[PDB]
Amino acid sequence: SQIQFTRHASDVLLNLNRLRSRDILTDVVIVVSREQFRAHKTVLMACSGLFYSIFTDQLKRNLSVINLDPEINPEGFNILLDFMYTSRLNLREGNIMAVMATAMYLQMEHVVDTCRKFIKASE
Amino acid sequence: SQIQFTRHASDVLLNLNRLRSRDILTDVVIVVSREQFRAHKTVLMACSGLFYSIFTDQLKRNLSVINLDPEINPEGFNILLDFMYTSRLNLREGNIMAVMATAMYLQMEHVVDTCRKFIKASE
């Protein structure tokens, strides 16, 4: 008989995005081609099987820079990082394949499943 | 026309609680009477006006221990910390006043408002 606050998690997440936008307590840079994106390892770990697997390792947890593979589309990554911090996924025919490839690489099932639904719902 | 993932923020928050429960990337201890609670400053800042005000200050951001006032009820704090990381508030006649005093101190409006509703809904 606890009281569930349906909007609390969204409120937290939006505030974490504000922290990211002000570089407050960010602790890692993700390098994708010529792009650098700062973020919070905790959020990355909470949103991605790949990042979880990297930073849960006692040896790799202290890394401050992670390089993603050169074949990763930087726009795909930016779209997924924004999703991580906002719950909103900008998905369009022009980017679905990049988003889906990136979400598979990052090990983000809900997004991959949604890309499947997008595909199934397009002609 | 972005796709909103209604459960994403909750999924993130639950994973952040798992990180807390394993002391992964925790960076502060909150001391309330004889109790010590480890947490993530980012989450505290995202959930509390008091903690936001403390750690947004460039001078106090690097603190690893925060002492709360001796008159703060440690159970009230534990209840609110759990709420921060789960969205679930364990509110009962036996603890409402402690929870509400602690939520006012921590500057958590939604919880304070809910305590008001609890009061208004009790005889």
Ligand SMILES: Cn1cc(C#CCn2cnc3c(c(-c4ccc(O)c(C#N)c4)cn3CC(=O)Nc3ccncc3Cl)c2=O)cn1
């Ligand atoms: C080839 N391929 C593989 C896949 C996959 C997969 C499965 N998977 C695994 N790990 C994941 C997640 C998601 C996740 C979370 C919210 C989302 O909204 C989405 C989306 N969207 C994803 C996060 N974490 C990491 C994780 O659990 N942290 C964790 C575990 C235990 N204690 C503490 C921590 Cl922090 C996830 O989906 C997709 N394609």
Ligand SMILES: Cn1cc(C#CCn2cnc3c(c(-c4ccc(O)c(C#N)c4)cn3CC(=O)Nc3ccncc3Cl)c2=O)cn1
């Ligand atoms: C005497 N009294 C005062 C009050 C109050 C108040 C107002 N207040 C202020 N700051 C707050 C919050 C809540 C909050 C969030 C989710 C919740 O579910 C609840 C609850 N529940 C609370 C969080 N933050 C901190 C904040 O905004 N971080 C922030 C701001 C800008 N960029 C980055 C960051 Cl991280 C808040 O409610 C209540 N009683």
Ligand SMILES: [Ca+2]
């Ligand atoms: Ca490579």
Ligand SMILES: [Ca+2]
């Ligand atoms: Ca005092």
